[PDB]
Coordinates of C-alpha atoms and ligand atoms in Angstrom, one line a residue:
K1 CA 88.7 -165.0 17.9
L2 CA 86.9 -167.5 20.0
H3 CA 83.2 -168.4 19.4
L4 CA 81.2 -169.1 22.5
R5 CA 77.7 -170.4 22.9
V6 CA 76.2 -168.7 25.9
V7 CA 73.1 -169.9 27.8
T8 CA 71.0 -167.4 29.8
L9 CA 67.8 -167.3 31.8
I10 CA 65.3 -164.4 31.7
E11 CA 65.3 -162.7 35.2
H12 CA 64.6 -159.0 35.6
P13 CA 66.6 -156.7 35.6
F14 CA 69.5 -159.0 34.7
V15 CA 68.1 -160.3 31.5
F16 CA 64.8 -159.4 29.7
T17 CA 63.4 -160.4 26.3
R18 CA 61.3 -158.7 23.7
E19 CA 60.4 -159.5 20.1
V20 CA 62.9 -158.7 17.3
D21 CA 62.2 -155.6 15.3
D22 CA 61.0 -155.3 11.7
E23 CA 64.4 -155.8 10.1
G24 CA 65.1 -158.9 12.2
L25 CA 67.4 -156.9 14.5
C26 CA 67.9 -155.7 18.2
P27 CA 69.1 -152.1 18.3
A28 CA 69.1 -152.1 22.0
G29 CA 69.9 -155.7 22.8
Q30 CA 71.3 -159.0 21.5
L31 CA 69.6 -161.4 19.1
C32 CA 69.0 -164.6 21.0
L33 CA 67.1 -167.8 20.5
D34 CA 64.4 -169.2 22.7
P35 CA 64.3 -172.8 21.2
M36 CA 63.1 -174.9 24.1
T37 CA 65.9 -177.5 23.6
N38 CA 68.9 -178.9 25.4
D39 CA 70.2 -180.7 22.3
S40 CA 73.5 -179.3 21.2
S41 CA 73.0 -180.5 17.6
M42 CA 69.7 -178.8 17.3
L43 CA 71.3 -175.6 18.6
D44 CA 74.2 -175.9 16.1
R45 CA 71.6 -176.3 13.4
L46 CA 69.5 -173.4 14.5
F47 CA 72.3 -170.9 14.9
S48 CA 73.8 -172.1 11.6
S49 CA 70.5 -171.1 10.0
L50 CA 70.2 -167.9 11.9
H51 CA 73.6 -166.7 10.6
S52 CA 72.9 -167.5 7.0
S53 CA 71.0 -165.7 4.2
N54 CA 68.8 -168.7 4.4
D55 CA 67.5 -168.0 7.9
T56 CA 64.5 -170.3 8.3
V57 CA 64.4 -170.1 12.1
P58 CA 60.8 -170.0 13.3
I59 CA 60.0 -166.5 14.5
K60 CA 58.6 -167.9 17.7
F61 CA 62.3 -168.7 18.6
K62 CA 63.8 -165.3 17.9
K63 CA 64.0 -162.7 20.6
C64 CA 66.0 -159.7 21.6
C65 CA 67.8 -160.1 24.9
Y66 CA 68.8 -157.0 26.9
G67 CA 69.6 -156.0 30.5
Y68 CA 72.4 -155.8 33.1
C69 CA 73.9 -159.2 32.2
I70 CA 73.7 -158.6 28.5
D71 CA 75.5 -155.3 28.9
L72 CA 78.1 -157.2 30.9
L73 CA 78.4 -159.9 28.3
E74 CA 78.9 -157.4 25.4
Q75 CA 81.7 -155.7 27.3
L76 CA 83.4 -159.1 28.0
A77 CA 83.1 -160.1 24.4
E78 CA 84.8 -156.8 23.3
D79 CA 87.6 -157.1 25.9
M80 CA 88.3 -160.8 25.4
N81 CA 87.7 -160.6 21.7
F82 CA 85.1 -163.3 21.3
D83 CA 81.8 -163.5 19.5
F84 CA 78.8 -165.4 20.8
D85 CA 75.5 -167.1 20.1
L86 CA 73.0 -166.6 22.9
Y87 CA 70.1 -168.9 23.8
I88 CA 67.5 -169.2 26.6
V89 CA 67.8 -172.3 28.8
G90 CA 65.1 -174.8 27.6
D91 CA 63.7 -175.8 31.0
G92 CA 63.8 -172.2 32.4
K93 CA 65.7 -173.3 35.5
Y94 CA 69.0 -172.2 37.1
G95 CA 69.7 -175.9 38.0
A96 CA 69.5 -178.5 40.6
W97 CA 70.5 -182.1 41.2
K98 CA 67.4 -184.0 40.4
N99 CA 66.9 -187.6 39.4
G100 CA 70.6 -188.3 39.0
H101 CA 71.6 -185.3 36.8
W102 CA 71.9 -181.6 36.9
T103 CA 69.1 -179.5 35.4
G104 CA 69.0 -176.0 33.9
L105 CA 72.1 -173.9 33.3
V106 CA 74.3 -176.3 35.3
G107 CA 73.2 -179.2 33.1
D108 CA 73.9 -177.4 29.8
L109 CA 77.4 -176.5 31.0
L110 CA 78.1 -180.1 32.1
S111 CA 76.8 -181.6 28.8
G112 CA 78.7 -179.1 26.7
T113 CA 75.5 -177.7 25.3
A114 CA 76.6 -174.2 26.4
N115 CA 80.1 -173.0 26.8
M116 CA 79.2 -170.3 29.4
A117 CA 76.2 -169.2 31.4
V118 CA 75.4 -165.6 31.9
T119 CA 72.5 -164.4 34.1
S120 CA 71.7 -163.8 37.8
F121 CA 73.3 -167.2 38.6
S122 CA 74.1 -167.9 42.2
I123 CA 77.4 -169.4 43.4
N124 CA 76.7 -172.1 46.0
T125 CA 78.7 -174.9 47.4
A126 CA 76.9 -177.7 45.5
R127 CA 77.3 -176.1 42.1
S128 CA 80.9 -175.2 42.9
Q129 CA 81.8 -178.9 43.1
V130 CA 80.8 -179.4 39.5
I131 CA 81.2 -176.2 37.4
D132 CA 83.6 -173.2 37.5
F133 CA 82.3 -169.8 38.6
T134 CA 84.1 -166.6 37.9
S135 CA 84.6 -163.9 40.5
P136 CA 81.2 -162.6 41.5
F137 CA 79.8 -159.6 39.8
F138 CA 76.9 -159.2 42.3
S139 CA 76.0 -160.4 45.8
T140 CA 72.6 -161.0 47.4
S141 CA 70.9 -162.4 50.5
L142 CA 67.8 -164.5 50.0
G143 CA 64.7 -162.5 50.8
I144 CA 61.1 -162.9 51.7
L145 CA 58.4 -160.9 49.8
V146 CA 55.0 -160.2 51.5
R147 CA 52.2 -157.7 51.1
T148 CA 52.1 -154.6 53.2
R149 CA 49.8 -155.1 56.2
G150 CA 49.9 -158.9 55.3
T151 CA 52.2 -161.7 56.5
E152 CA 55.0 -160.5 59.0
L153 CA 58.1 -162.6 59.4
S154 CA 61.4 -162.2 61.3
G155 CA 63.4 -164.0 58.7
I156 CA 63.9 -167.7 57.8
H157 CA 63.7 -168.9 61.4
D158 CA 60.3 -167.4 62.0
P159 CA 58.1 -170.1 63.7
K160 CA 55.3 -169.2 61.2
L161 CA 57.4 -170.9 58.6
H162 CA 58.4 -173.9 60.7
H163 CA 55.0 -174.6 62.2
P164 CA 52.7 -173.2 59.6
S165 CA 49.1 -172.5 60.2
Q166 CA 46.5 -174.2 58.0
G167 CA 46.4 -172.4 54.6
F168 CA 49.7 -170.5 55.1
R169 CA 51.1 -170.6 51.6
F170 CA 54.8 -169.9 51.0
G171 CA 57.1 -171.1 48.3
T172 CA 60.3 -170.5 46.3
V173 CA 61.5 -171.0 42.7
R174 CA 61.9 -174.7 41.7
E175 CA 65.5 -175.8 41.0
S176 CA 67.0 -172.5 42.3
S177 CA 69.7 -172.0 44.9
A178 CA 67.0 -170.9 47.3
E179 CA 65.3 -174.3 47.1
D180 CA 68.7 -176.0 47.6
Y181 CA 69.3 -173.9 50.7
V182 CA 65.9 -174.8 52.2
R183 CA 66.2 -178.4 51.2
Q184 CA 69.6 -178.7 52.9
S185 CA 68.9 -176.6 56.0
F186 CA 65.2 -177.1 56.7
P187 CA 64.1 -180.5 55.2
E188 CA 60.6 -180.4 56.8
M189 CA 60.1 -176.8 55.5
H190 CA 61.2 -177.9 52.1
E191 CA 58.6 -180.7 52.1
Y192 CA 55.9 -178.2 53.1
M193 CA 56.9 -175.8 50.4
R194 CA 56.8 -178.3 47.6
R195 CA 53.1 -177.7 46.7
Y196 CA 53.7 -173.9 46.7
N197 CA 56.9 -173.6 44.7
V198 CA 56.8 -172.0 41.3
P199 CA 58.6 -172.5 38.0
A200 CA 60.0 -169.0 37.8
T201 CA 60.4 -165.8 39.9
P202 CA 57.7 -163.8 38.1
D203 CA 55.2 -166.5 38.9
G204 CA 56.0 -166.2 42.7
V205 CA 55.8 -162.4 42.5
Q206 CA 52.4 -162.5 40.6
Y207 CA 51.0 -165.0 43.1
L208 CA 51.9 -162.8 46.0
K209 CA 51.2 -159.4 44.5
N210 CA 48.1 -159.9 42.3
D211 CA 44.5 -160.9 43.2
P212 CA 43.4 -163.6 43.6
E213 CA 46.3 -164.0 46.0
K214 CA 48.0 -167.5 45.7
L215 CA 50.9 -167.0 48.1
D216 CA 51.2 -165.3 51.5
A217 CA 55.0 -165.1 51.2
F218 CA 57.5 -165.8 48.5
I219 CA 61.2 -166.6 49.1
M220 CA 63.8 -165.8 46.5
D221 CA 67.0 -163.8 45.9
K222 CA 66.6 -160.4 47.6
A223 CA 68.1 -158.5 44.7
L224 CA 65.3 -159.8 42.5
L225 CA 62.6 -159.1 45.0
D226 CA 63.9 -155.6 45.7
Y227 CA 63.7 -154.8 42.0
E228 CA 60.0 -155.9 42.0
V229 CA 59.4 -153.8 45.2
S230 CA 60.9 -150.8 43.5
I231 CA 58.6 -150.9 40.5
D232 CA 55.5 -151.6 42.7
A233 CA 53.2 -148.8 41.7
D234 CA 50.8 -149.2 44.6
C235 CA 53.6 -149.6 47.0
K236 CA 51.9 -152.7 48.4
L237 CA 54.9 -155.1 48.5
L238 CA 57.8 -155.3 50.9
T239 CA 60.7 -157.5 51.8
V240 CA 61.0 -158.6 55.4
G241 CA 63.3 -160.3 57.9
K242 CA 67.0 -160.7 58.6
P243 CA 69.4 -161.6 55.8
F244 CA 70.2 -165.3 55.1
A245 CA 72.0 -167.5 52.6
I246 CA 74.0 -164.7 51.1
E247 CA 75.5 -165.7 47.7
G248 CA 77.4 -164.1 44.8
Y249 CA 76.2 -164.1 41.2
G250 CA 78.9 -165.4 38.9
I251 CA 79.4 -166.4 35.3
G252 CA 79.4 -170.2 34.9
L253 CA 81.8 -172.3 32.9
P254 CA 82.8 -175.9 32.7
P255 CA 85.1 -177.1 35.5
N256 CA 88.7 -176.2 35.0
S257 CA 87.9 -174.0 32.0
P258 CA 90.9 -172.0 30.8
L259 CA 88.5 -169.0 30.2
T260 CA 87.5 -168.6 33.8
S261 CA 90.6 -166.7 35.1
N262 CA 90.5 -164.2 32.2
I263 CA 86.8 -163.5 32.7
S264 CA 87.3 -163.1 36.5
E265 CA 90.2 -160.7 35.9
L266 CA 87.9 -158.5 33.7
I267 CA 85.0 -158.7 36.2
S268 CA 87.3 -157.6 39.0
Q269 CA 88.6 -154.7 36.8
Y270 CA 85.0 -153.7 35.9
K271 CA 84.1 -153.6 39.5
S272 CA 87.2 -151.6 40.5
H273 CA 86.6 -149.0 37.8
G274 CA 82.9 -148.4 38.4
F275 CA 81.4 -150.4 35.6
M276 CA 79.2 -152.4 38.0
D277 CA 78.0 -149.2 39.5
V278 CA 77.1 -147.9 36.1
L279 CA 75.2 -151.1 35.4
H280 CA 73.4 -151.0 38.7
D281 CA 72.4 -147.3 38.1
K282 CA 71.2 -148.2 34.6
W283 CA 69.0 -151.2 35.5
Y284 CA 67.8 -150.5 39.1
Ligands
BR1 BR1 66.3 -154.3 21.3
CL2 CL1 80.3 -158.7 44.2
CL3 CL1 49.9 -148.9 54.8
CL4 CL1 58.4 -176.2 36.7

């Protein structure tokens, strides 16, 4: 029985968090930590405490994690016969190459702080050079969220994005695969966006959707934007334009991990036996 430390990132509907219940448990999820650290020794120490009868973990660090990726992770743990500790990535980022290192989930895999990363994690070329990805369990285009009767765009090649009018505000999530795509394909656009990019997907959605409006368009994974559109009560949001930058979501492991093939096998079986469809129906 292997024991894996798993890093995740809260992104609806793939992973959500809520507080633990009265008896310190998670009847409909998995106990996780939200410790704001990338120090492997601190995590060891915290999970050691969490498992003991002398649990002195600050409550501010304890959460219940639930969602599509947590259901996936539980099934993998049962089929591969491993148990796991689960924590939320300290910097809240998926990961990018910045100032000579990798940040976010990619960084924790490369430092050995996490054994595996499970969330809506995009497989792209740059990350593929440094970490392993399993077979994908989901696929998504990038998308562009706007208000109804608001900004209209043809897709990522719209001149409004490339020769922006004064005060036209559009951004993406910092240190995501969407930022890496814009940075590598449209350097001048990437520069323009810097002042408008946001730390996390919910921030971009809030800035576009809520008043006072802070963004005119928000670019991020279409699967995530479509979820927000589907729960839009006032039906005042939409996604626009042609597809672009289609990527799979995969589980991340260190390069050349011996676990990758076994997890890929299971993901492929889950897909071919309708489990992905069940998870999609459950969470979307
Ligand atoms: Br729960
Ligand atoms: Cl897929
Ligand atoms: Cl209307
Ligand atoms: Cl940030």
